[PDB]
C-alpha cells in the first residue's frame, strides 16, 4: 500500500525557519523505518513515550513530521518540559509528548561565507506559545508606553533576527536540521 515519503522529509532541497516550521502529514503507507536506522550520523535521536526499536511493531492513525533548522546549543530545547527562547516563542512540545526527535548537523549545506540570512528566528514576543502553534506575524513590537505606529526606532523593534551562519563559527553555533515525528492513536513492515 505504497510507502510514504520519509526520504523527501529528510533530503529536501531546503528547510524552513524555526518560526515557520513546515508540517507534513503522513498516512496510509507501510512505514519502513529502516531508512532512519541505515543513516546514523545523528547528533540527537531521542524518542519519548515509545521505544525506538519497537517502531515497526505498532501502528497509529496518522503521523506528523515537523521540519526546521536551529543552532546546536538550542537543540536541547526541543523536548517536553523545557524552557528557553525557542521553547517559549518559536516551538513548544506538550508535556505528554509521544514522539521522536531527530537532529543532525548541516554545516556544509546551510552555512555560507559571509553569512546566510535566509534562516530567521523570533526574538521578541509577549507571551509563551501554546503547544503546536505557529506565529508568522511581522508586526513591530512595543517595548515602552508609546505606540509604535508601524515604524522602527527606540522601544520599537522588529521581532525577527537572522542567524547569520558562516563556517568560521563554533560547533554549538553551527546550523542543525531538526525533524520531529509526532504519533497519535500508518503501520510498520
Amino acid at each position: 500500500t505504497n510507502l510514504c515519503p520519509f526520504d523527501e522529509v529528510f533530503n529536501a532541497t531546503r528547510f524552513a525557519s524555526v518560526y515557520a516550521w513546515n508540517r507534513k502529514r503522513i498516512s496510509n503507507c507501510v512505514a519502513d523505518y529502516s531508512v532512519l536506522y541505515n543513516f546514523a550520523p545523528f547528533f540527537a535521536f531521542k524518542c519519548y513515550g515509545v521505544s525506538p526499536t519497537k517502531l515497526n511493531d505498532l501502528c497509529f492513525t496518522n503521523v506528523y513530521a515537523d521540519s526546521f533548522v536551529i543552532r546546536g546549543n538550542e537543540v536541547s530545547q526541543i523536548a517536553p518540559g523545557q524552557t528557553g527562547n525557542i521553547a517559549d516563542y518559536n516551538y513548544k512540545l506538550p508535556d505528554d509528548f509521544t514522539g521522536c526527535v531527530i537532529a543532525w548537523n548541516s554545516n556544509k549545506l546551510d552555512s555560507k561565507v559571509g553569512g546566510n540570512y535566509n534562516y530567521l528566528y523570533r526574538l521578541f514576543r509577549k507571551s509563551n506559545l501554546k503547544p503546536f502553534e505557529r506565529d508568522i506575524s511581522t508586526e513591530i513590537y512595543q517595548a515602552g508606553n508609546k505606540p509604535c505606529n508601524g515604524v522602527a526606532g527606540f522601544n520599537c523593534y522588529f521581532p525577527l533576527r537572522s542567524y547569520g551562519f558562516r563556517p568560521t563559527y563554533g560547533v554549538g553555533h553551527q546550523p542543525y536540521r531538526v525533524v520531529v515525528l509526532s504519533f497519535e492513536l500508518v503501520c510498520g513492515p
Partner: antibody
Amino acid sequence: VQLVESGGGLVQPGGSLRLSCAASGFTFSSYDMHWVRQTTGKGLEWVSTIGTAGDTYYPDSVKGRFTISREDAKNSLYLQMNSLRAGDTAVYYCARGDSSGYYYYFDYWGQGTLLTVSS
Amino acid sequence: DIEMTQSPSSLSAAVGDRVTITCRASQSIGSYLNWYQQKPGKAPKLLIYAASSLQSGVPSRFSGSGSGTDFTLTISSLQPEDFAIYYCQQSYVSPTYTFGPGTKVDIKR
C-alpha cells in the same frame, strides 16, 4: 529462560576486551538485548542496547568506545570495549527487553561478570 | 537526563508490617515507571511495570501507586525474603533509561 555471561577479567588501562552472553529457553531473534552495568557508588546505569533490525544505540559516555553485536545462529551477544578507562570497573549484566502496550521493561537478567581495570 | 530520587535511604521493619518507599521524578513521566528488587550478590528481578501493573510470577503482596512526579511502592506483609534493595526506573525518555539510588529494607530488633 537462562542467560549466562563470560569474559570478565582484569585489563590494564587502554585495553580492549570482549564479553559474551549466551541465551537459552526462548527465541533469540524476536527480542531486544541490553547491556547494563552496576557500580558500588553510582548504582545502575545503562550502557548498550541492540534491537531486531540491526540498530545499535549508545549513551554519551560510551559512544565510539564500545561496540555491540549479536549472532542469532549461536544465540550469542558480544560487547567489545576499546580505550578502557579506570572508571569503567563494574559488574555487567546482559538483559532481555520486552514491551507491554507501549511500556518497556527488562524482564530477565543475567548473572553478571566483574570487570576491574587498573595498573 | 531525568534525575530520579528515592526516600527513605534506609528503612527497618519487622515481619508482618506494611512498608512504603517513595520515588520522585524531575519531570512528569506519566505512568512510565518500573520497580526492581535485588538481593545481595544476585541479579536484579522485575517487580512492577507501568507503575501499577504487577509482573506475572510475583507475590500479590507487592503493589505500586502514584503518577506524575510521585510514586510509591507498598508491601502489605513483610517476609524474610523481602530483605533486599529496591530501585525505581523511568521508561519515558529513550534510549537513555535512568535508574534511582535505591533503598535497603532491613529487619528491626
